[PDB]
Amino acid sequence: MIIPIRCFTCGKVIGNKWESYLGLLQAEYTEGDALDALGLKRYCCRRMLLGHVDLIEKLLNYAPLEK
Amino acid sequence: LLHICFLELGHDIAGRFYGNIQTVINNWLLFEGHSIGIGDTIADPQTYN
Amino acid sequence: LKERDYNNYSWQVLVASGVVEYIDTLEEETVMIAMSPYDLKQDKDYAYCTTYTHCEIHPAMILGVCASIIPFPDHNQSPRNTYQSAMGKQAMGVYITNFHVRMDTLAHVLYYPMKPLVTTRSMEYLRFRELPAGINSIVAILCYTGYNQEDSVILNASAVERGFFRSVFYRSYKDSENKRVGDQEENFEKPHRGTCQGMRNAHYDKLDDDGIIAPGIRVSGDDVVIGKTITLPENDDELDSNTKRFSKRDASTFLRNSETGIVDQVMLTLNSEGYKFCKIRVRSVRIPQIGDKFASRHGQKGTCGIQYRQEDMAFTCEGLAPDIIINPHAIPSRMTIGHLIECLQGKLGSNKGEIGDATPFNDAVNVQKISTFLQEYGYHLRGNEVMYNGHTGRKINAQVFLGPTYYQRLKHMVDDKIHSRARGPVQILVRQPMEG
Amino acid sequence: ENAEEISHELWQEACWIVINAYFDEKGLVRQQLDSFDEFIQMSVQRIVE
Amino acid sequence: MNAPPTFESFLLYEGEKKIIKELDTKVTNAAIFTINKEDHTLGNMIRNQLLKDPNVLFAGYKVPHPLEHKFVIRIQTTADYSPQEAFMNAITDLLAELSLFEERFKDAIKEKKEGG
Amino acid sequence: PYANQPSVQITELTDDNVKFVLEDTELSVANSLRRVFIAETPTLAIDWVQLEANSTVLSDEFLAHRIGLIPLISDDVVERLQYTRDCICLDFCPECSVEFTLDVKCSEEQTRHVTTADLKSSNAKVLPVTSRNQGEEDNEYGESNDEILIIKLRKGQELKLRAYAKKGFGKEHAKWNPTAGVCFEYDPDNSMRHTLYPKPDEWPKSEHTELEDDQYEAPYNWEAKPNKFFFNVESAGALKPENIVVMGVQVLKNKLSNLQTQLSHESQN
Amino acid sequence: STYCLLSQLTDRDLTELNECPLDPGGYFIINGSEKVLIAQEKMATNTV
Amino acid sequence: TAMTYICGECHHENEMRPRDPIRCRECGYRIMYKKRTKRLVVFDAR
Amino acid sequence: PYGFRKRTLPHFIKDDYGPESRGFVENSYLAGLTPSEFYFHAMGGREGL
Amino acid sequence: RVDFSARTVITPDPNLRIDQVGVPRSIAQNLTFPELVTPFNIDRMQELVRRGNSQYPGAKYIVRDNGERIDLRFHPKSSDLHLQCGYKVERHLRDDDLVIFNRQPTLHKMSMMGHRVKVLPWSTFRMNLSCTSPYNADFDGDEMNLHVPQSMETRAEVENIHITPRQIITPQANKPVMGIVQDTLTAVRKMTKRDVFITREQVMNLLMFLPTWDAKMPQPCILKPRPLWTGKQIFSLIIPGNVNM
RNA sequence: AAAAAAAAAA
Ligand SMILES: [Zn+2]
Ligand SMILES: [Zn+2]
Ligand SMILES: [Zn+2]
């Protein structure tokens, strides 16, 4: 539901490169140019961002149990 | 080979021979390696024609 | 149909326009249906038919829900497609978005659900993009120490320690009081040794004053989790009044023996009978280990033979340690070329940065086209890579095929299937061991 | 009149837009809800009449 | 539930000797050294430093099981040189070689940082 | 029968990556150096997690696993800190563990992105890697969110936690891995035929190659031995890559000296 | 369905009631248990 | 002791002795949840 | 078998005995199947189960 | 139904010999072997009942001559821990224990063997790959059973009849039922090729995985300029005795 | 605690 901290195959830190990936994707970039701008030159780190889903945004829409 | 090594040597020697094959072969396979791929499924274009 | 996304040109307008008709299976004997308009544009000298009445919108909709999830199902075997449809319902993932408030007896939630990089256009409408089940993982196809034989797989320990297929199993228990006017009375409170008869040997200190545990308390073994004490029947014997040392009996609900975890959610309400009704959800951590059942999207089921750390297994020239290794000998017998096409398209889409299309019966996707596009990205055109030994560092003599695929974990864990018994209960009739 | 004829890649895009509109309107569980509405509205009135 | 602890791959237990020496009886001047709680790294170093010695005729490591962190080395030499002395000279030469590696790497980092 | 005399040639050096060539050394040296850089190189990572408020949409163990993988700057700290088993302490001495705290309560209508910057440290030097990112005031990249996102919170959710970070290496757990992929390569022209190309024309050339355009494989040399190796060590942000090399060599000193000490102890029998 | 309380509700209205917007429904709730009715094959009646 | 729960839709701290019926005192809602405990339990970050 | 009236599928012609409507597959699994011969492979693969 | 039995999912283990089975630690702690008390091993059974069920290896019960059972779980009295000659101690399953290994459905005689227990940490059954042909196992979620003999004359019957190497040849078609399969057979095919020229270091690596070797290395096929062996020369060391074929 | 039904794995 959230981005992982590290690349599984690789160990590269990917937790800081998801909201920047979204911000690059929304303006005018494609996915490949956004991955190239983030420094993820290996496709092992690129597959962590190409197929990532953010299900915690749907989880945060629900009302919390404690006010 | 397995049948005649059972019949000529005995049960225990053949059973040890079974285990003596596989460890050496699997350790040699680390040096050699074996792999199938999508390139093995594609033949010559002349053969395809 | 490009402005029904704007306002109003719905599908019923398209049906009412006279271009789409509901043809049933009885009317199929009297109509003529084609694959494509390319069949319509054929010249009459070599035309297969000249009187066409209908045309298929897309043939790939002849599949169902769990059979359309296979990337390139036309390159695979039909019994293996049936196997993938059978174990497609046994995949692990986020089953629903409001699972935090739902109360299911058995549930599983993956940490990081992954949408498939190699996907069709059919899972856009099954909401598998929004609710996925499975993980894209780097796999190679080679033989490493013989532990992957007979459909077996070997995971990477460093990836699993980073969070590869680690999941949470939710288990729900429930209990209820009964205050019927003719019945024994039971109440929810913390049991006491001097007041309850036949108390089982458990740790009763974890319960609260109402006999119901608080969430966040770690439970393990045979810890008591719901405290219910039932009033004993009025067997007031006048021959000996000192024999009634207990007025209540323990009717508590206990944790399952071979499960440990943390109490996630605690629920009290009123049932249809108006009595108190408790429902508790306890979460447990399911780390992948040896023997856990994994499967592909092409019917390549198997179990984890062994785990290997990153320093003790194969690595490429780019230092890429794959997440998972499989047996090549499982490939030709199962007849899964679509798995190889999925791997090649996954490597191409991960190097390029695009979501791959795996729609069946599509002439725009070819093996040679994917090979030609993959050749431009500095890799081998058949997707082969040169790796090294993990223990020694020597180059592998045979080049190996590597790339990302989509693998799905299965619910047949070894923790839910291990059983051992020395001596235990016997039946009241035949004095034989139990069942289950 | 030939401008209304759909080309090949336009045919694949148009047919997937048709599939998108069909799944946007009808959905996946349309027959269950439709049979439930048939049972609730017309069938119960037919039983009591 | 049967998961072994993750610190057992490098930590000896109570009363567990690290190096166990067994005298081979098939040939002469041969020994087997068993080292626990390690992996292919140290055995590969010991072996590929021993193989440069012409005085040795047999030097070989083997891990019997990936789940058991333990490996054995069989060493047989000629009849003028102990296998234990051969292994001692091997680890001494390894220490000298990677000390040279450490100082050449330190000099390389110093010249690369000062050169800009 | 004596030791080798190897040589160094560093080609590229930056903050998180180093590229170098080793000359005149064995293949086991390079393979075990890669092994000790990945596995047995120690660093500091969060190990002991205590939660006092977890009213978010995530579980306790998922948040603990997410904060355990966060790299920490431990270049000058890991060589002095001892292990927990090697201390006479019991209640987490400052020479044994590093204390971190976090307490974020969201009271705004927008989403609060709790990142590593909210993880305060008792030690003045043991910090996350985002201290290198907060000093970039020339941010023409367009986005200032260069920090590792720990969790997102809505209004009414709070998170309070106390953590102790200990010393460990990647063989024990992958959260103590200091590198982010070590590239190792020998003989890029296949002069030794250690690997067998059925079609050498279909394979792209390596970056360390020495052949021209129309030549695809070097001529076979049976007398050739592995003595030239290319290494590209990329850091994950926890440690500097030359410091990763230095502590890997020091771990190799400790292991070989321990083997020598054990041999000298068992020799008197 | 048409007569249920979740008829033609938005995603925000379903989320405020702690319901999944992606949930298609199609099931009954009997004593808190989700029950699904399987369609049964049969012969076509009034057919020769 | 007379301890507390959270109402399903009020999200309100309702306190009672554990013999009262399960009912919110502000809106009358049969659904209540138990508060997370104050006991601190150690979690490993592996 | 002719499941329909002298047709295996409605996409063919009545009284057709050619290998496209018969069930012969002229393409490999690497090249991909047409939907009719994929359905015929489903016919073949159901019988083994 | 039987009492002393277990069942779990099987996983491959190539380095194990065929007459061995890998047993999980919790199964070996739960299942007990009822060993008699002898003067030959009085001290070992004494230290086993002193360790008890809390530590592995240990014991769970002492059954004495008159049928009285003494437990270890509920803090046993030290006066009850007396081991006279001829008593019964239900010890834990240690190494080299003969057990029955059976996969269901059992279609023939060869689908249940006798095996020697080797204790491995993980919670699956571990055995040799050549067991896959008589058991018809596929390692795709196969649940499979193990049984422990509770009398040592039955253990002698397991050793003399039910063991795997005594059941190599089927009487059904006078053929072996286990064989070299999968990538082991593929590398046997790829290793006996004439062009496979293998160095001193690689055959040196392959040497220690032959425990029946007589520590007499062969003279190489190639002596100058580089000492090289071949695949048939090193498969020759694997084959014992006088074999002509 | 029994029995019945359903869902599955081999
Ligand atoms: Zn990576
Ligand atoms: Zn300390
Ligand atoms: Zn309320």
In degrees rounded to 5, what are phi and psi of residue F245?
-65, -45
The single residue of C151, C210, C264, C415 carrying the catalytic annotation is: C151
SS3 J6: strand
Instruction: Work out the angle at residue J117's Cα, subtended by the Cα atoms of residues J58 and C308, and round it to the nearest 5 degrees.
Output: 100
Query: Residue C43, Cβ neighbours under 10 Å: how many?
Result: 6
Closest Cα in chain A, distance from residue C194 (Å): 38
Whether residue F96 is annotated as binding a ligand: the answer is yes
- d(Cα J179, Cα J196) in Å, to the nearest integer? 24
Whether residue J3 is annotated as binding a ligand: the answer is no
Sign of CA dihedral C315, C316, C319, C322: negative
CB J98 within 8 A of CB J114: yes
Chain K nucleotides reached by a protein CB under 7 Å: 2, 8-10
Note whether G26 contacts D27, CB cutoff 8 Å. no
Say which amino acid occupies A48. M
| Sequence-ordered list of residues with C-beta below 8 angstroms from that of J169, at least 6 positions apart, any chain | B3, B6, B7, J175, J176, J177
Q: Does F196 touch chain E (CB under 8 A)?
A: no
| Sequence-ordered list of residues with C-beta below 8 angstroms from that of C90, at least 6 positions apart, any chain | C295, C410, C411, C412
Chain E residues whose beta carbon lies within 8 Å of the beta carbon of residue F35: 39-41
Query: Residue D18, Cβ neighbours under 10 Å: how many?
Result: 17
Compute, in angstroms, the gap from residue A6 CA to the centroid of ligand 1: 8
* Residue ranges in C304-394 assigned as alpha helix (H): 330-334, 338-352, 367-375
Compute, in angstroms, the gap from residue F81 CA to the centroid of ligand 2: 8
Instruction: Work out the angle at residue F223's Cα, subtended by the Cα atoms of residues F222 and F228, and round it to the nearest 5 degrees.
Output: 105
Q: Give which of H12, H33, H43 to mutate to test F binding, by max F Cβ within 10 Å.
A: H43
Closest Cα in chain C, distance from residue D49 (Å): 32
SS3 F119: coil
Say which amino acid occupies J13. D
> Any idea which nucleotide's C1' is nearest the CA of C90?
K8
SS3 F143: coil
What's the Å distance between residue C291 CA and nucleotide K10 C1'?
15
SS3 F124: coil
Q: Which of C323, C325, C312, C316 is nearest to C140 (CA)?
A: C325
Closest Cα in chain H, distance from residue A66 (Å): 6
Closest Cα in chain F, distance from residue C212 (Å): 20
What's the Å distance between residue J55 CA and nucleotide K8 C1'?
38
SS3 F167: strand
J 111-150 residues inside an 8 A Cβ radius of B: 128-130
Say which amino acid occupies A40. L
J and E: touch, per 3+ CB pairs < 8 A? yes
Q: Does C162 touch chain F (CB under 8 A)?
A: yes
Q: Which of F235, F222, B2 is nearest to A11 (CA)?
A: F235
I and E: touch, per 3+ CB pairs < 8 A? no
Q: Which two tokens stand for residue B18?
A: 């079974």
Note whether C353 contacts A9, CB cutoff 8 Å. no
Sequence ranges of the binding site of A: 7, 10, 44-45
I 20-49 residues inside an 8 A Cβ radius of C: 29-30, 32-35, 38-39, 41-42, 44-46, 48-49
Q: Can you tell me which residue has its alpha carbon closest to the C1' of nucleotide K2? A: C428
Q: DSSP string covering C47-64, please?
A: -S-S---EE-S-GGGGS-
Q: List Cα–Cα distances, C250 to C24, C145, C198, C254, J74, in angstroms.
A: 63, 55, 6, 11, 22
What's the Å distance between residue C101 CA and nucleotide K2 C1'?
35
- d(Cα A31, Cα A46) in Å, to the nearest integer? 9
Q: DSSP string covering I15-33, please?
A: T--SHHHHT---S-TTT--
Note whether G22 contacts C131, CB cutoff 8 Å. yes
Least CB-CB distance to I32: which of C34, C62, C75?
A: C75
DSSP label at residue A35: H
What's the Å distance between residue I49 CA and nucleotide K3 C1'?
34
- d(Cα C201, Cα C188) in Å, to the nearest integer? 19
Say which amino acid occupies G9. L
Q: List Cα–Cα distances, C123 to C97, C117, C279, D23, F161, in angstroms.
A: 18, 12, 35, 11, 40
- d(Cα E112, Cα H21) in Å, to the nearest integer? 77
What's the Å distance between residue J104 CA and nucleotide K7 C1'?
22
CB C315 within 8 A of CB C344: no
Tokens 């010991």 belong to: E46
Query: Residue F236, Cβ neighbours under 10 Å: how many?
Result: 23
Say which amino acid occupies B37. G
- d(Cα C28, Cα C358) in Å, to the nearest integer? 29
Say which amino acid occupies F82. Q
Chain H residues whose beta carbon lies within 8 Å of the beta carbon of residue A6: none
Q: Give which of C98, C138, C161 to mutate to test F binding, by max F Cβ within 10 Å.
A: C161
Closest Cα in chain F, distance from residue E26 (Å): 22
Chain A residues whose beta carbon lies within 8 Å of the beta carbon of residue G15: 61-62
- d(Cα C189, Cα C49) in Å, to the nearest integer? 81
Nearest ligand, CA of residue H14? 3
Chains that touch C (3 or more CB pairs under 8 A): A, B, D, E, F, G, H, I, J
Q: Does C391 touch chain B (CB under 8 A)?
A: yes
CB E1 within 8 A of CB C415: yes
D 1-40 residues inside an 8 A Cβ radius of G: 27-29, 32-33, 36-37, 40
G and D: touch, per 3+ CB pairs < 8 A? yes
- d(Cα J219, Cα C42) in Å, to the nearest integer? 74
Q: Which of C436, G29, C313, C40 is nearest to B30 (CA)?
A: C313
Active site residue C210: no
Least CB-CB distance to J165: which of B12, B21, B34?
A: B12
Note whether A9 contacts C352, CB cutoff 8 Å. no
Say which amino acid occupies A19. E
Q: Give which of H9, H13, H34, H46 to mutate to test F binding, by max F Cβ within 10 Å.
A: H46
CB C126 within 8 A of CB C68: yes
- d(Cα F29, Cα J214) in Å, to the nearest integer? 32
Buried b (16+ CB within 10 A) or exposed e, E71-107: bbbbbbbeeeeebbebbbbbbebbbebbebbbebbee
Q: Which two tokens stand for residue H24?
A: 């919110």
Q: Which of E83, E91, E104, E4 is nearest to E43 (CA)?
A: E91
- d(Cα C110, Cα C133) in Å, to the nearest integer? 8
CB J109 within 8 A of CB J88: no
What's the Å distance between residue G2 CA and nucleotide K6 C1'?
29
Q: List Cα–Cα distances, E21 to E25, E55, E84, E89, F36, in angstroms.
A: 13, 20, 9, 17, 26
Residues with CB under 7 A from strand K: C 86-87, 89-90, 301, 412, 434-435; J 104-105, 138, 140-143
Instruction: Work out the angle at residue J15's Cα, subtended by the Cα atoms of residues J12 and J17, and round it to the nearest 5 degrees.
Output: 90
CB C323 within 8 A of CB A10: no
